Structure formats: structure tokens, C-alpha cells
Amino acid sequence: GCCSDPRCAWRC
């Protein structure tokens, strides 16, 4: 999950 994974979570 984007919002879960820190490397994606910033985009969320």
C-alpha cells in the first residue's frame, strides 16, 4: 500500500 509504505506514503 502506498500510504503504508514510507517511500510512497509521502505522496499519499
Side-chain angles (χ1 to χ4, degrees):
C2 187
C3 311
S4 316
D5 182 62
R7 303 179 299 260
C8 196
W10 56 286
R11 309 171 195 172
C12 178

